[PDB]
Design a protein around this ligand. Structure first.
Ligand SMILES: CCc1cncnc1N1CCN(Cc2nc3cc(C(F)(F)F)ccc3[nH]2)CC1
Length: 317
């Protein structure tokens, strides 16, 4: 009758949210103890293959450490972490709003009024990551998800699926010239562009032809844009890192003070009091309408042991 153990047998596998090389992401229901009947996302990783590559072991541990350390409204929360021999488990909150990119397709284009909200919430998460000395490097529409009410949540701090897309990355990543916090304000710019045009600013016929267009860095001004958004974009998508907005000593604050966010109340927005532009389909909590039909499956598939010593975690709440 002590504290709860948190084994894999504590969860019922409902469905597959994502499959990748290193493991699987399930939608699960906690069936015993504390949160009985509550829905989670469960990331399950294969120990055997993580330990083969130091860079892989890094991101797995980083994610684990990052998510324990970071508690924030616009960053996905880690509920439990535990392990078996051969497998690692991460229990994260289930985000039923799906991808933000998903809304974009349906809308075709975001209005600046709507884009602002999502960018501002993303900006808060990004600046906080920087207060914790962390650089998302590759931020892209695939990484931004929505909670049940439609608020921003940032999500893959660990391994990569399929062992991604470069058109949202800063030129300095590609030229290996070294990077910094400003790399994300670039990626934010690339996102803003995608939000208001439907496409990334620099795209090519192939892997390298895309790369060169980014390094070229040619402005493309759609006529329907306001000067605020126009000017905001030109500062974020500056090739020059030092001259980029958010690269200064004020970081996120320097970006957020922009007249494009002149209508934003941050005290309210961070409290998540502001109504999101999209309250997404509400059939039930375990509503899975937006990810599949892609994944619809339901199945779970050693010498020098440590690492993954002290991997176990349970969020205080
Ligand atoms: C866990 C956060 C989340 C919360 N709520 C609902 N949906 C979510 N996701 C967000 C992440 N996910 C994309 C994805 N990341 C993956 C990582 C792997 C890995 F094993 F790490 F290689 C494998 C497949 C993966 N699919 C879709 C389901």
């Amino acid at each position: 009758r002590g504290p709860e153990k948190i084994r894999p047998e504590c969860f019922e596998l409902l469905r597959v949210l994502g499959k990748g090389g290193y493991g699987k992401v399930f939608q699960v229901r906690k069936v015993t103890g504390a949160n009985t009947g509550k829905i989670f996302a469960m990331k399950v990783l294969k120990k055997a293959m993580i330990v083969r590559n130091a860079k892989d072991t890094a991101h797995t541990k980083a994610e684990r450490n990052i998510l324990e350390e970071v508690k924030h409204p616009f960053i996905v929360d880690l509920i439990y972490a535990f392990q078996t021999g051969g497998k690692l488990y991460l229990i994260l909150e289930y985000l039923s709003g799906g991808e933000l990119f998903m809304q974009l397709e349906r809308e075709g284009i975001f209005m600046e009024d709507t884009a602002c909200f999502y960018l501002a919430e993303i900006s808060m998460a990004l600046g906080h990551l920087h207060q914790k000395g962390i650089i998302y490097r590759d931020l892209k529409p695939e990484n931004i998800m929505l909670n049940h009410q439609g608020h921003v949540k940032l999500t893959d701090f660990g391994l990569c699926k399929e062992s991604g897309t470069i058109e949202y990355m800063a030129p300095e990543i590609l030229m290996r010239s070294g990077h910094n916090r400003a790399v994300d304000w670039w990626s934010l710019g690339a996102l803003m562009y995608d939000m208001l045009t439907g496409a990334p600013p620099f795209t090519g016929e192939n892997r390298k032809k895309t790369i060169d267009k980014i390094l070229k860095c040619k402005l493309n001004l759609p006529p329907y844009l306001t000067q605020e958004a126009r000017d905001l974009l030109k500062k974020l998508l500056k090739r020059n890192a030092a001259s980029r907005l958010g690269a200064g000593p004020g970081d996120a604050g320097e970006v957020q003070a922009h007249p494009f966010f002149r209508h934003i109340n941050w005290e309210e927005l961070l409290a998540r009091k502001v109504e999101p532009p999209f309250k997404p389909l509400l059939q039930s909590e375990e509503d899975v309408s937006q990810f599949d039909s892609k994944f619809t499956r339901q199945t779970p598939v050693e010498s020098a042991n440590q690492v993954f010593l002290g991997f176990e975690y349970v969020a205080p709440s």
